[PDB]
């Protein structure tokens, strides 16, 4: 029962899987680049300098990897590289311990679906004493085992002796990440994505000169594919992260620059690159065609094939006379309907019994697939997958491109139109350009009911109508959520804040994504104003989708009684006119003391007063209240972050927070002093004695009297 | 507003496909060469039904009525009613809901009121025993179509309650490459406001034709009299050839016109059923568009269905070109290795379409 699981679908090619994608991440100056150059010199025996952009090397006969040294300061780079990445070489300084950036990245990976994490520890030569080193090793390893699973192994590196880490530890790390053995994930096995290897603009320089460096240029993008076969027809929408939402104008697959040497020798075997073994390009050194031809009318199609409305439902028969004349006899469909002579009779009885039973208990799949419902489910999965495989293997030209599209590991180029001058100008190769093909639900725009909680290590809670730069799907954008609760499952009353240790519902405008989808949001993506605080502010999932919500904010109306009798009171200062009191008359009203009532009739001579019957004699000092509900609306804000469009690529600044705009405009925290809390001291009251009527006191009998 | 279309052909199909995908469409030149150019009352009422069942959708209709523009929204459904104009019956207004039934946010409970039969469109028993088993094969379990009151042309006054509860995520893929073997011939011969001698004579004519065969024949009489029989009298008969080993059905039906012969109608319906069986391969020529649409919206996988060259007609070509223009999904046809007949397996790589409305 440890080995049981939840079944899932693995959409990876058995034929030519793409390079696995590893993200070397961590703090600013923790030798995150040296690790890449020394791991590459291990894998391919050539020292490299000026590593920038993705860089693909080839491991073993069947593997190839893609190194991504992430820029250590940009949270958007952390977010989308945690969306795409597969093996995370997360590196922790030894002397300094864990840092906030490592911490934040582990949290966004945990929320967007955990890739294979692998810690390495650096600066282990700066430790003065072997016992301090050993204790710190154990402390790091156990905190790491708290965050990542327990038993997770992390490596230890000494000092950079020649711009390179020790060969034995690098060899161990290489063997591990070359037998890493990854696992399926839902988002990665639902969508197509790519990490663009090479980037090229496409216009004429004459067009640029005529337009004056403002025309949005065509862009060619080269890279491998992953995840899900990208459909080969042009004009599908695909979101480039941090640039915007474009559509592919033209697709074409290419010869891949790094073919794995198994595949290379297999091509050479079929036919009858050993020096260039890395790839850092950003760095330097028939009825079917009858049907689908559009110019042919379907009459001509059927005419050539042999040699009409659809709003009607019945098919086009012929004359009943011809039909009866043809169907006097049934021996044309008698085949569809259902010693030597004895043997033939037993065989036809076996066939009759076979058609009688059919598929009832035919191996039951249970004893066939070894008495575990999980194995049965995964066997169904694998059977469907191999049927997919043989049907794909049937034909070359269309069954590879037109039907399924470019699978994965097909080194493809794609050109887009209307791509900004800011992108082409401020493009620098130190940043990842990842691309995710969307869906219908992800191209729509509505409001999402999410449920979210404040992050546990975040200090301050999140206010309603406070902008949140959140990441949900391939998109990062700031919105104006509204944090709601159901008052014991009757109505979605909005709160004013986040409950500090549990989940509240939220609702917010923004591009839709599927149900059950986890997401996480920060408040400040701008690196220039971070401080020592934890950046990640909210975690949650999105549950459902609509275009509107009936969302209530409670408002209560107060009045004050000014003349009271037994069980009746005249109430003032709650309405303005007799028309208003008539509009609200017949009301379940109550007072601070907790006695119930109703407003009964509009009083005539004052303008707003009325008479209200309570259940008991209300005091004069008390304040009546009338609970009622008022509908609020969701603000329709949506501002997607465009940091790759920005030139500085950090310090993207959008809508400031409420505290920030108050401090900048130099206002004050609004607070009516009548609403604060006090420490009261309720005195003991001595009620007056009873006063009998004098007629009663006279007419009382002699003994039972007041003496 | 972007994907353009011409002609008034396959109108409800184009509306259903745009609602399923989400791409905004624009149909133009709806019966230009007409004395009354533009839409019809039943097409406008069908669009009212669409906007009743969905949410956030926008349907712009030009003042000439010849150009409609659809920007779809999400599917919600719920419980409601609809009033069929007398030009077209409840079968014609039910079939798009049979497409859009199990991908909603709430269950379908729609009370249709109007005529319940015609020569062109599906009757109630036709809908049930011809298209409910196909949805049950594709995964929709708790679907039902009750008949509260049965109307008849040309005055109608009938009521049917369509209830669908099996809110599935996506239809499971289907692999039917073998020609099914028909087990029994069930049928329903119904009538309103006449003597049931007519129903008995229809069943006698049908059994008189089917006496050549050896499979069992069970055709139930369904007479409606009283206050829940509707206004006009009428009669009709449907036959289903049921393959019980796999749960497949091939159906054929008709109704009787003003002063026809019930025995002639029974023999004509039996002849039409035999013709549909002979031209059929695992589906019927009228269940086929439902099966193709369900295979295209099934999950990202290759589904296989064994169709026949007689089932390949111009209607099939038009359906497939519409599906290519909406979903960009080609259908691959391979000739089966069988030497006697000329069947072809249709392979469809169903795209990832999920019931993304349903709250979890």
């Amino acid at each position: 029962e440890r080995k049981l699981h939840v079944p899932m679908v693995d959409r990876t090619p058995e034929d030519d899987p793409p390079p696995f994608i590893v993200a070397v991440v961590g703090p600013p100056g923790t030798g995150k680049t040296t690790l890449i150059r020394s791991l590459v010199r291990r894998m391919t025996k050539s020292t490299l300098n000026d590593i920038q952009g993705p860089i693909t090397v080839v491991s073993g006969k069947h593997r190839r990897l893609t190194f991504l040294e992430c820029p250590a300061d940009d949270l958007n780079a952390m977010i989308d590289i945690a969306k795409i990445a597969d093996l995370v070489l997360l590196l922790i300084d030894g002397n300094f311990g864990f840092e906030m950036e490592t911490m934040e990245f582990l949290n966004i990976a945990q929320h967007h679906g955990m890739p294979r994490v692998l810690g390495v520890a650096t600066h282990l030569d700066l430790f003065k004493s072997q016992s301090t080193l050993r204790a710190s090793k154990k402390r790091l390893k156990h905190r790491f085992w708290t965050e990542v699973y327990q038993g997770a192994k992390l490596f230890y590196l000494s000092g950079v002796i020649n711009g390179r880490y020790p060969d034995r530890e690098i060899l161990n790390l290489s063997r591990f990440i070359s037998v890493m053995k990854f696992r399926p994930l839902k988002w990665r096995n639902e969508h197509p994505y790519m990490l663009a290897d090479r980037f090229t603009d496409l216009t004429h320089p004459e067009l640029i000169e005529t337009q004056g460096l403002q025309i949005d240029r065509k862009v060619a993008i080269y890279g491998y594919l992953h995840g899900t076969p990208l459909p080969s027809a042009p004009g599908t929408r695909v979101h480039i992260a941090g640039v915007g939402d474009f559509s592919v104008a033209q697709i074409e697959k290419l010869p891949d620059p790094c073919p794995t040497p198994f595949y290379q020798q297999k091509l050479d075997d079929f036919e009858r690159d050993k020096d260039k073994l890395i790839y850092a390009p950003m760095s330097d050194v028939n009825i079917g065609k009858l049907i689908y031809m559009d110019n042919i009318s379907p009459e001509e199609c059927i005419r050539r094939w042999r040699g009409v409305d659809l709003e009607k439902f019945v098919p086009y028969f012929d004359t009943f006379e011809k039909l009866a004349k043809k169907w006097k006899s049934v021996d044309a469909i008698k085949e569809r309907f259902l010693r030597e002579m004895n043997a033939a009779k037993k065989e036809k009885l076996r066939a009759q019994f076979e058609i009688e039973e059919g598929e009832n208990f035919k191996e039951d799949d249970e004893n066939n697939e070894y008495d575990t419902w999980y194995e049965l489910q995964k066997a169904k999965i694998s059977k469907q997958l191999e049927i997919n495989n043989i049907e794909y293997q049937e034909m070359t030209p269309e069954q590879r491109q037109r039907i399924e599209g470019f699978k994965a590991g097909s080194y493809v180029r794609i050109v887009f139109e209307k791509v900004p001058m800011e992108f082409v100008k401020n493009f620098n190769p130190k940043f990842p350009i990842v691309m995710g093909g969307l869906l219908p639900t992800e191209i729509k725009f509505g409001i999402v009911k999410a449920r979210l909680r404040r992050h546990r290590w975040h200090k301050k809670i999140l206010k309603t109508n406070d902008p949140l730069v959140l990441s949900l799907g391939w998109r990062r954008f700031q919105t104006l959520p509204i944090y709601t609760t159901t008052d014991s499952r009757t109505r979605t009353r909005m709160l004013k804040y986040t409950p500090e240790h549990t989940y509240c519902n939220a609702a917010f405008y923004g591009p839709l994504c599927s149900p059950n989808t986890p997401f996480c949001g920060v408040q400040i993506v701008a690196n220039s104003d971070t401080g020592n605080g934890f950046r990640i502010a909210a975690t949650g999932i999105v549950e459902e989708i609509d275009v509107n919500i009936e969302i209530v904010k409670k408002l209560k109306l107060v009045g004050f009684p000014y003349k009271i009798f037994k069980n009746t009171a005249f109430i003032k200062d709650m309405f303005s006119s007799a028309m208003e009191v008539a509009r609200f008359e017949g009301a379940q009203i109550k007072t601070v003391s907790g006695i119930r009532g109703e407003i009964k009739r509009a009083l005539s001579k004052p303008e707003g007063h009325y008479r209200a019957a309570f259940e008991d004699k209300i005091l004069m000092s008390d304040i009546v209240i009338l609970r009622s509900w008022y509908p609020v609306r969701v603000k329709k804000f949506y501002n997607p972050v465009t940091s790759l469009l920005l030139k500085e690529k950090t310090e993207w600044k959008g809508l400031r927070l409420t505290g920030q705009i108050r401090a900048a405009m130099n206002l004050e925290t609004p607070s009516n002093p009548d609403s604060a809390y006090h420490k009261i001291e309720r005195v003991e009251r001595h009620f007056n004695g009873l006063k009998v009527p004098k007629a009663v006191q006279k007419e009382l009998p002699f003994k039972s009297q007041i003496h | 507003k972007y994907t353009t279309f011409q002609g008034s052909q396959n109108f409800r199909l184009r509306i259903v496909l745009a609602t399923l995908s989400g791409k905004p469409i624009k149909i133009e030149k709806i019966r230009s060469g007409d004395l009354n150019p533009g839409l019809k009352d039943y097409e406008v009422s069908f669009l009212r039904l669409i906007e009743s069942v969905t949410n956030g959708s926008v349907i712009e209709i030009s003042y000439t009525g010849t150009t409609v523009i659809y920007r779809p929204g999400i599917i919600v459904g719920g419980a409601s009613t609809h009033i069929c104009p007398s030009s077209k019956p409840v079968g014609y207004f039910v079939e798009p809901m049979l497409y859009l039934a199990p991908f909603s946010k709430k269950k379908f409970s729609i009370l249709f009121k109007g005529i319940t039969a015609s020569h062109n469109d599906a009757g109630i028993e036709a809908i049930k025993w011809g298209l409910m088993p196909v949805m049950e094969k594709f995964g929709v379990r708790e679907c039902a179509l009750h008949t509260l009151k049965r109307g008849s042309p040309p005055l109608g006054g009938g009521e049917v309650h369509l209830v669908v509860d099996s809110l599935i995520a996506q239809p499971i893929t289907m692999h039917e490459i073998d020609r099914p073997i028909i087990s029994s011939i069930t049928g329903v011969a119904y009538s309103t406001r006449v003597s049931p001698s007519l129903v008995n004579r229809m069943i006698d004519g049908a059994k008189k034709v089917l006496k050549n065969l050896q499979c069992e024949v069970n055709i139930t009489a369904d007479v409606w009299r009283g206050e829940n029989s509707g206004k006009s009298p009428g009669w009709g008969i449907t036959l289903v050839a049921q393959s019980k080993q796999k749960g497949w059905s091939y159906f054929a039906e008709d109704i009787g016109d003003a002063g026809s012969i019930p025995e002639e109608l029974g023999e004509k319906v039996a002849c039409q059923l035999l013709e549909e069986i002979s031209k059929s391969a695992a589906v019927g020529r009228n269940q086929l568009p439902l099966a193709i649409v369900y295979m295209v919206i099934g999950k990202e996988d290759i589904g296989r269905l064994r169709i026949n060259k007689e089932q390949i007609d111009e209607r099939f070509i038009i359906l497939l070109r519409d599906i290519k223009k909406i979903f960009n999904t080609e259908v691959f046809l391979k000739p089966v290795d069988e030497a006697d007949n000329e069947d072809m397996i249709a392979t469809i790589k169903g795209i990832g379409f999920t019931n993304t409305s349903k709250k979890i």
Partner: peptide
């Protein structure tokens, strides 16, 4: 009730 709960509408022109 109808105009309170529903959202989408038809632009009927003639």
């Amino acid at each position: 009730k109808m105009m309170k709960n529903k959202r989408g509408g038809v632009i009927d022109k003639r």
